[PDB]
Amino acid sequence: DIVMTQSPDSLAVSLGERATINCKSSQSVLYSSNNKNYLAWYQQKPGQPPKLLIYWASTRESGVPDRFSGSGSGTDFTLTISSLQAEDVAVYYCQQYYSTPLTFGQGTKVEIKRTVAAPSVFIFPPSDEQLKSGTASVVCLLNNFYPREAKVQWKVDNALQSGNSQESVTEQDSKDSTYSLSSTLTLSKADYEKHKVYACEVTHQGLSSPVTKSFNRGEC
Amino acid sequence: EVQLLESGGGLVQPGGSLRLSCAASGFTFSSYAMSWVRQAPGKGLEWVSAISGSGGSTYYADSVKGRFTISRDNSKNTLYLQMNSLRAEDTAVYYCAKYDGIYGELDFWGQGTLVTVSSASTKGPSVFPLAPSGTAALGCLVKDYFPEPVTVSWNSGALTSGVHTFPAVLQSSGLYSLSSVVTVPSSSLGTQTYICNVNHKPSNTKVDKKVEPKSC
Numbered sequence: 001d002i003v004m005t006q007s008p009d010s011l012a013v014s015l016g017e018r019a020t021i022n023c024k025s026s027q028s029v030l031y032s033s034n035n036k037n038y039l040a041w042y043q044q045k046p047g048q049p050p051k052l053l054i055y056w057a058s059t060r061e062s063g064v065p066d067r068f069s070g071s072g073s074g075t076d077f078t079l080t081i082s083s084l085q086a087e088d089v090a091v092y093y094c095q096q097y098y099s100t101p102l103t104f105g106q107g108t109k110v111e112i113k114r115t116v117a118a119p120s121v122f123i124f125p126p127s128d129e130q131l132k133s134g135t136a137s138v139v140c141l142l143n144n145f146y147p148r149e150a151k152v153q154w155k156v157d158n159a160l161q162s163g164n165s166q167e168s169v170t171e172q173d174s175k176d177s178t179y180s181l182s183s184t185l186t187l188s189k190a191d192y193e194k195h196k197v198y199a200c201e202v203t204h205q206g207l208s209s210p211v212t213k214s215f216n217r218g219e220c
Numbered sequence: 221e222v223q224l225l226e227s228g229g230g231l232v233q234p235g236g237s238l239r240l241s242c243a244a245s246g247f248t249f250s251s252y253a254m255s256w257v258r259q260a261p262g263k264g265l266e267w268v269s270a271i272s273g274s275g276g277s278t279y280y281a282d283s284v285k286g287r288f289t290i291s292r293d294n295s296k297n298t299l300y301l302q303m304n305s306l307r308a309e310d311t312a313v314y315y316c317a318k319y320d321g322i323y324g325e326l327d328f329w330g331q332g333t334l335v336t337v338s339s340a341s342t343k344g345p346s347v348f349p350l351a352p353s354g355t356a357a358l359g360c361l362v363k364d365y366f367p368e369p370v371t372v373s374w375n376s377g378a379l380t381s382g383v384h385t386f387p388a389v390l391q392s393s394g395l396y397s398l399s400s401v402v403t404v405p406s407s408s409l410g411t412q413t414y415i416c417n418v419n420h421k422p423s424n425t426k427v428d429k430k431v432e433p434k435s436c
Binding site: 038040042044048049050051052055056061093095097100101102103104105106107120122124125126127129130133137139141143166167168169170180182184186220 | 255264265266267270279281282315320323324325326327328329330331332346348349350351355357359361363384386387388389391397398399401403434436
């Protein structure tokens, strides 16, 4: 079984600059008979199936822009994306189709390197309807920020909450190249009603110092 | 146009069986070899099985050999994957994929169908408001459901700009939860109605939730 190994795993490139992804196959995929490499490159955007970019190591599929070019032979291969565009954020896979089993590389995530952008922060109290069920979810949203690194700290009456929140992050936006993040603090209705001040504190490179959004339980 | 539409995926017990289908159209199905390729959540692509254009030849990955059976019906234009003795590790989106006529690469893929191998129960979500207090944010919290997926739209698809629907996270209860948010002009809060349309097809749960500033 041919092992496809991509390099690097993750790549951050400025818009308009060049992205290069290396792929090494453990056996040559160059077929002597026709002198062609049985190597393909795929692009996969979030929520979508892989899309074929390049076959024969170097031949571009119909409808695929000139900025995508494949090169190499035998075991070593390279995908080059010149003039990186915002819409090019994706995971890229090399694949050998030389012999069964067809094998794929582990994938390379291409991220866009843009200017720093501070998150817009919003806190949401639990609804009355949820509270009646016995649980309180408190939500903090960090909207449209760059880079991805961010720190969210939950405080309930000055006590830092640890172990009782979960975070989810969007895939980098295809237009503005930012991320958004939601953190959800979950507690029992009984715990919720024992405390007053609920606060989300956000630390990010784009903020001159941390931003806190807060509410007092029951207060307008 | 060329089309591959997978169906038959869903929640199944470990040790259980499931049959996937793929309806091919827009091309001469029998002319081309076909493949099944899977992708576990957050992971890479794994080739599963291939079948010749006639059906005379079949190939399988080692991980699926003896458990899965690829087959096709050229009169119906349909590819099948019979999956037996399922394991938690077989949980994946399963893609139907067409080979190129001569060269032999996978040049077209369907949208995929999700297979979840688990003993956990189907459960529909509860939907709660994330109420707003230049730009305001509001949203819906879609909490405590199983299995994936859920869909969320805003205003029946009329509102798409500034919407962020977050990846679902698995809670320690073994149930998923997700939020969908949108940013809107704060001046819109008095006039414009904002409703999130939530559908969890696996549990037959459809909810429309109107979200507005909370009254004092």
